[PDB]
Amino acid sequence: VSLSPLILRSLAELQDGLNTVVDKNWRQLRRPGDWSLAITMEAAELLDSYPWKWWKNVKAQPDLQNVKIELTDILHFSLSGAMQVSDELADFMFFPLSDTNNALASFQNIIRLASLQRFQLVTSAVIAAADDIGFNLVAYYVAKHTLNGIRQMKGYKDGTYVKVQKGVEDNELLHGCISPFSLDDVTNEGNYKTKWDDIMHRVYDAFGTPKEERLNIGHWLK
Amino acid sequence: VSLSPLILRSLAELQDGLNTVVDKNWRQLRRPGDWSLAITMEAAELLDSYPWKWWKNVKAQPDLQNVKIELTDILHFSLSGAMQVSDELADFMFFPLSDTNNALASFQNIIRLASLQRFQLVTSAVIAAADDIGFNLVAYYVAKHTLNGIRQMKGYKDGTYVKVQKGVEDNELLHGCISPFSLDDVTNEGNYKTKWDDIMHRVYDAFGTPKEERLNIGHWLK
Ligand SMILES: O=c1ccn([C@H]2C[C@H](O)[C@@H](COP(=O)(O)O)O2)c(=O)[nH]1
Ligand SMILES: O=c1ccn([C@H]2C[C@H](O)[C@@H](COP(=O)(O)O)O2)c(=O)[nH]1
Ligand SMILES: [Mg+2]
Ligand SMILES: [Mg+2]
Ligand SMILES: [Mg+2]
Ligand SMILES: [Mg+2]
Numbered sequence A, B: 001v002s003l004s005p006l007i008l009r010s011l012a013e014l015q016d017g018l019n020t021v022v023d024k025n026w027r028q029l030r031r032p033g034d035w036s037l038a039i040t041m042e043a044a045e046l047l048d049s050y051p052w053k054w055w056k057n058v059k060a061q062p063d064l065q066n067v068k069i070e071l072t073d074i075l076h077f078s079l080s081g082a083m084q085v086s087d088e089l090a091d092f093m094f095f096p097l098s099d100t101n102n103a104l105a106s107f108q109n110i111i112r113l114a115s116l117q118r119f120q121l122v123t124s125a126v127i128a129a130a131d132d133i134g135f136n137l138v139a140y141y142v143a144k145h146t147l148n149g150i151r152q153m154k155g156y157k158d159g160t161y162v163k164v165q166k167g168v169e170d171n172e173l174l175h176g177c178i179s180p181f182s183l184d185d186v187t188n189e190g191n192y193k194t195k196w197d198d199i200m201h202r203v204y205d206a207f208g209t210p211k212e213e214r215l216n217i218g219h220w221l222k
């Protein structure tokens, strides 16, 4: 249903920090329609994790691990949209999402909500989806946030980064960085920041980031 | 603005024939929401032909030739949707489409129209876009229709087809199959069918289709 407001605020802080790595003055440069488009396009990636096409590889299997990654990407963009516009559940999300027909309908409705700039509702939708599917959305967020920062360090913005190397997409390495961590670990009121820092360092390890280039949890929090 | 109704009807006939190659009973198996999803996903391909991302290869150039292909793909799906539901312009398309901001807005609005199952309006939008950009939509349709059929012959539906070979995407070969043909050639009331047949054989040539496997224009027309 919902995250603790203190956890949500820390996620928002991380998101602002990441947006600032991309551009120092992102709050002036970006507009709500940018985040609508970004969510639309991640939702298309999410939809394409399923075998929806009736004319192309009809017996393909759903990439349910990639679903987690794309929902996490949507979260980054819905947090970002919410920092620019206030929006001023059971209608548009259909459970269980393990049913492919429910997933295709629900994730198409995320596109509609994005186009209406209902970013907070999109955030609520992703939280509800992670609860239904049963994955650790907060831990996924911290891990992908870290990979996002790594990508920026390694030339994503100037077109020199390569996402798939030796048969492995960078995103795939995140699953094992996160699996040691429980839901309680990453939402505990007193100790969550240390566990987020642990996730970050596991991701930096996975990409061989030199120690001097690593940004710890405190870099991101206000 | 609009095509001749006789030209539109022949396109619809070709579309029905192609849909029948994919599945004999497509008219029972498919539902309007399928075509909405298909158009959404082609519109995402269309949007991704532009350098819209502010965090990833920011100085990339638009793939304006691929725009033509993706609009043509949308047409196939909007024709198909219109065969299942009646819908029972200047608001949602913004010219010139050579302006990237106009294109991103317009093509996002195609997604909205698709989700509303306004398939005839989507068709009108594609016709208007081709008129504005200045490409031969009918010739593009016939060429991609032919490649679509070829793909089905070569295992697209069972996952054995390879779209990009030796650095060239199959779609790229279509441009040169079409460039000899004028707008008048492919819409002339008396002779258009022969010119469509010519396009088809040029596409079969490009993919080395044995003569016995080729389907001529008459296969597709009622
Ligand atoms: O201003 C931005 C731009 C991008 N992203 C992140 C969010 C997603 O997790 C990720 C998606 O990158 P792609 O793989 O689509 O390129 O980018 C941000 O957080 N802020
Ligand atoms: O029932 C169908 C399914 C697919 N297509 C065609 C339309 C598009 O031109 C093409 C897109 O194929 P992809 O490259 O997305 O897979 O498929 C049809 O015409 N009818
Ligand atoms: Mg993406
Ligand atoms: Mg992806
Ligand atoms: Mg993604
Ligand atoms: Mg496609």
Ligand SMILES: [Mg+2]
Pocket (backbone or CB within 6 Å): B045, B070
């Ligand atoms: Mg394409």
Ligand SMILES: [Mg+2]
Pocket (backbone or CB within 6 Å): B042, B045, B069, B070, B073
């Ligand atoms: Mg396409």
